[PDB]
């Protein structure tokens, strides 16, 4: 079976008392649902839940109103019927360029302590070493205090010589926002005095919340007045900077306290994910969102929920395929499965500082086959050899990936990154495969998901495929055994 | 002496007369599952078959005291329990429950009103809630008296058309959590009249204040910025008060700087704009013989410098899962409020407290709010409050090592915090919606429940817009009345002073600070010694030393200073007369008429625009 929701630990096919189905952070948890879900689930011998339910999801391995935030007021074949009959599509496609060059994080590299004088230092090294940028996206913290808009001073002395300087080595921007306003940023008074953050159980004053950042109110993007003051601030900050669009961080529930009130009542708590991720469409083309609830429709990228530097499928390499998987099964095309690398968390990091070398350059691989692809922690962290397997893989991404992504993207309005059983529905091996992938019909993708290992087990399904170095394979379906896939190489093949 | 039926019972004293009558209106006994053993009668279930913890247990305290305990406990949640409480016949009268925003003496409770959470709250917009100081205590003229259990998760509504309180056990829509099944329980006293049977459960039920605050308290004057200044008090104003109170002659017990004389609320220090030599003013009133008082609150606004600190600290009152601070509204805006259950939020309170007494030698504070009415529906505190009043006494508790000029306006068992008790804002009006009339009763209601060092506000009221018989200021016949009343009182306090009137104004309140100094004062001094043993109050009813005298017992317009200094004030405009009652024994007036042909209506008594009726006991 296949659908559902992201999970912290994400297994494809998907393999614990009824909990609210609702948008959480699930970066700490095993138990929760991820930001992005949908009440549909799909299996391999070819279910959407009616959107009316107080729907509560719990799982038996065995087997295989009260006490909720609800308040009451072939296998192909028959998931394109389900797709089409339940899932809005995106109408549009985001930037070509974010289907081509990398995106630049400053997150994973720099963390909170992010500066001016680091953003145009990583700028000028993302030039030296002769990448492409599809932008660069500054994060957490160029604010004095969260919920204000205008930059630090202290950090950033002078913000506009810096967007000049970025503008003019050819560098669009993007910039971190979220829905939270602390109770000692300049602007917490003015949400509390024009009602713009989302209220107790009364509906008379705001509710304080706690996030990874710390306390204070959450707008209410159900509230006209609350929305129009989100977008002003962030039509200012293009105004004013050029700012291309917004990453849209948070958007989960499980940041809205347990009963709450709204302008709008929300008898489906999740409702509001959706409504937030609406303030990405004025920017749509470059923004991201990290939550999904009937968000399909939003024609922005869909960013996996951080992704931990290790092997396994507890937010690591092993996860990428599965979680991308999961979404694009879900509606949602646009697909960046977070940091190349993952954000070498400390106590959560295969290696120490960084991702282990090896670690870094099979998640360079894989991600340069998916719909965007994002560094933080930068090749020439690493060594020479590093950045040569980047380049290698961007100039392999622009000639081969981009030019299919991009008219995938346009024939949306089907995922993008398909499982092996979408033009195989028939096949048992193609329906368990969790290290395998396609970009469209035509391009079957076998990356090295093992550390120590110079080959892999490939399965092409029927029909014949040409390898990257050529060879026909026309007898299938076969398993082609111990693969050679070196260090700085992934098996693709083409349909033929 | 008790008939149990089905749908009630009745109790008679030793006289035969019905003094207790009582309607179950949850259900009825099935009295086939009663049964006697000895002093208990219990019932195990209802006439509907649900099984019923009920007994009523007869206790024999003394010869002269029979009580009746009576537990009506339900087997589970779902079901609320009621008893209606008939106040009986027209000769039956009943004191205590709460401080109401129209107060009457004996207790009338007009229309009808469904049971509601029996807890401190502001009742200065409301005549539905019961005010800052409240007891579960009824007494009635014909010597029997109620003490409603503390266990009791209470609720009190009234029906005007069978004159009945409500009594209510619940545990939805309410503040009110079990401790971590409703029960209405009480008990009912008996006695041979009415000051006997009260004097009992005064004993039994209130702790007294182990302490008298300061004798100038009892005598001078205390002068308060509110009423005159408003908000925009400031240092000019303050001195300018000050020298007018020096300048008019008139004693000072401690001057009172009220709201508002900080940056924001929630910051404890003062606002140098407002306030630009704090010191030198402290110090100018001082040299001046002036003692201050501080005007406080238990509210953090959002936008104050210790707002965050408090966020950091956890000192608030939290939402329900008990993680973080829940925002209250108050009349000076939105913040947090200090949970005083919190060892960490009182050390920080009486720190800021005592930095304020060290910095600039106050003396005490007023400490207003206080009500539950001011928390969030459901809350959370670092002890959990299953009675949400008993943060109200734990507020009180802050007024404890400052008690000798502390001002509170709420009590909740706060009875042994031997500091004053303000009445909530009275209005300048005559009637008995927060006006003159509502004194007495206000005050001898608060004096029932064991509090007898009360402030009846600001003589002449609060002068609020649309609240003021006259416009900017109370009209001046008003003002006077009101003044000389307030001098009889346990302590006077002006805010709109007598120079905003005139020459006669003041004069007529330099006569009554006089009497009060050489006649009130004493005898409220020595009444206050004497609490600390007795437990009697200082403002006491008429019907006090006259308990079987039925006049004596609806009497609204006079009281007695102890048992000996018997007050009639006029309480109406455009009149230089009114009638005395005077109880049985001998009664000399002020200008020495000795009246022992008693009892006895003085009809049409002269009492002009500058005089007060007194009477001595002889
Ligand atoms: C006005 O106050 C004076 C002075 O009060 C005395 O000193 C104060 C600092 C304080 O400690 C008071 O408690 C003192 O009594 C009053 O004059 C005194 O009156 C009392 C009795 O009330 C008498 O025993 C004292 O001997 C007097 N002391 C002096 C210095 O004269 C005066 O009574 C007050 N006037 C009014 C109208 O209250
Ligand atoms: C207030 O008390 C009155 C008097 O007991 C109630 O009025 C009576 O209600 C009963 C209900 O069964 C009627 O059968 C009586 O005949 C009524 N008599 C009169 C004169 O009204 C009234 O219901 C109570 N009010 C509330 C709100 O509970
Ligand atoms: C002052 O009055 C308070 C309020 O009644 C008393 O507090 C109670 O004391 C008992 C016994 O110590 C405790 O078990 C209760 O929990 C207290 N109640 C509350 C609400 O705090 C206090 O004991 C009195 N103190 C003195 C010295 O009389
Ligand atoms: C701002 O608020 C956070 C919690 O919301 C707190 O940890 C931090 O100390 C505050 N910063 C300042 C400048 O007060
Ligand atoms: C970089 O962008 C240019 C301009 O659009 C494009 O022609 C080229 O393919 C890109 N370079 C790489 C390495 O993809
Ligand atoms: C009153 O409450 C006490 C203490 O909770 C309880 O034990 C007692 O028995 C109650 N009295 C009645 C008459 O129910
Ligand atoms: C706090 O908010 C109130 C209400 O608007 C405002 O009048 C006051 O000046 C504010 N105080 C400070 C110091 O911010
Ligand atoms: C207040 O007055 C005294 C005496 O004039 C002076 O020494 C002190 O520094 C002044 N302080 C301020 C706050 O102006
Ligand atoms: O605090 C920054 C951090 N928050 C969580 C997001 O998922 C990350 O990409 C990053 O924006
Ligand atoms: O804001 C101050 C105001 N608040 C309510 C009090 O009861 C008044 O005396 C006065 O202190």
């Avoid at 559902?4 to 952070?25: K, L």
């Avoid at 719990?58 to 006490?67: C, F």
């Avoid at 993007?221 to 129009?228: L, V």
């Avoid at 392999?396 to 033009?423: K, M, N, Q």
Wanted: charged share 25%; with cysteine.
């Amino acid at each position: 079976w296949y659908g559902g929701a992201e999970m912290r630990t994400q297994h494809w096919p998907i393999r614990q008392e009824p909990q609210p189905f609702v948008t959480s952070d699930v970066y700490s948890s095993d138990a929760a649902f991820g930001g992005i879900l949908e009440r549909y689930w799909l299996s391999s011998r070819a279910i959407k839940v009616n959107d009316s339910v107080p729907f509560h999801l719990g799982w038996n391995s065995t087997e295989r109103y009260h006490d909720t935030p609800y308040k009451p007021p072939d296998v192909t074949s028959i998931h394109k019927y389900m797709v089409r009959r339940y899932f809005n599509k995106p109408s549009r496609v985001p930037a070509p360029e974010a289907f081509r060059d990398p995106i630049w994080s400053t997150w994973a590299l720099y963390g909170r302590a992010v500066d001016q004088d680091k953003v145009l230092r990583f700028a000028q090294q993302i030039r030296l070493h002769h990448f492409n940028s599809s932008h660069l996206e500054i994060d957490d913290m160029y604010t004095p205090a969260y919920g204000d808009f205008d930059f630090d001073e202290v950090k950033f002395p002078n913000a506009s010589d810096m967007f000049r300087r970025l503008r003019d080595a050819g560098f669009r921007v993007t910039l971190w926002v979220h829905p939270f306003v602390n109770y000692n940023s300049s602007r917490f008074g003015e949400g509390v005095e024009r009602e713009l953050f989302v209220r107790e159980p009364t509906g008379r004053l705001p509710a304080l919340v706690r996030w990874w950042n710390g306390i204070g109110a959450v707008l209410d993007f159900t509230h006209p007045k609350a929305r129009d003051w989100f977008q002003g601030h962030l039509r200012r900050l293009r105004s004013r900077y050029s700012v291309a669009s917004f990453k849209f961080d948070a958007g989960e529930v499980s940041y809205l306290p347990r009963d709450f009130s709204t302008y709008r009542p929300l008898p489906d708590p999740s409702v509001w994910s959706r409504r937030y991720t609406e303030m990405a469409l004025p920017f749509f083309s470059l923004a991201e969102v990290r939550v999904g609830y009937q968000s399909q429709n939003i024609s922005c990228f869909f960013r996996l929920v951080d992704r931990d530097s290790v092997w396994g499928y507890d937010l690591g390499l092993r996860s990428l395929i599965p979680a991308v998987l999961t979404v694009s099964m879900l509606g949602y095309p646009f697909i960046l499965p977070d940091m190349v690398g993952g954000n070498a968390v400390p106590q959560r990091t295969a290696g120490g500082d960084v991702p282990e070398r090896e670690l870094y350059i099979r998640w360079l691989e894989v991600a340069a086959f998916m719909p965007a692809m994002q560094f933080s922690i930068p090749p020439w962290r690493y060594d020479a050899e590093v950045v040569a397997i980047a380049q290698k893989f961007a100039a392999l991404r622009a000639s081969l990936v981009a030019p299919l992504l991009l008219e995938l993207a346009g024939e949306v309005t089907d995922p993008i990154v398909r499982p092996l059983w979408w033009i195989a529905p028939g096949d048992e091996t193609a329906h368990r495969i969790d290290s395998q992938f396609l970009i469209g019909d035509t391009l079957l993708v076998a990356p090295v998901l093992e550390p120590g290992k110079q080959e892999r087990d490939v399965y092409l399904p029927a029909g014949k495929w040409r390898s990257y170095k050529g060879e026909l394979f026309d007898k299938t379906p076969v398993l082609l055994t111990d693969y050679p896939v070196d260090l700085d190489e992934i098996a693709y093949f083409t349909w033929a």
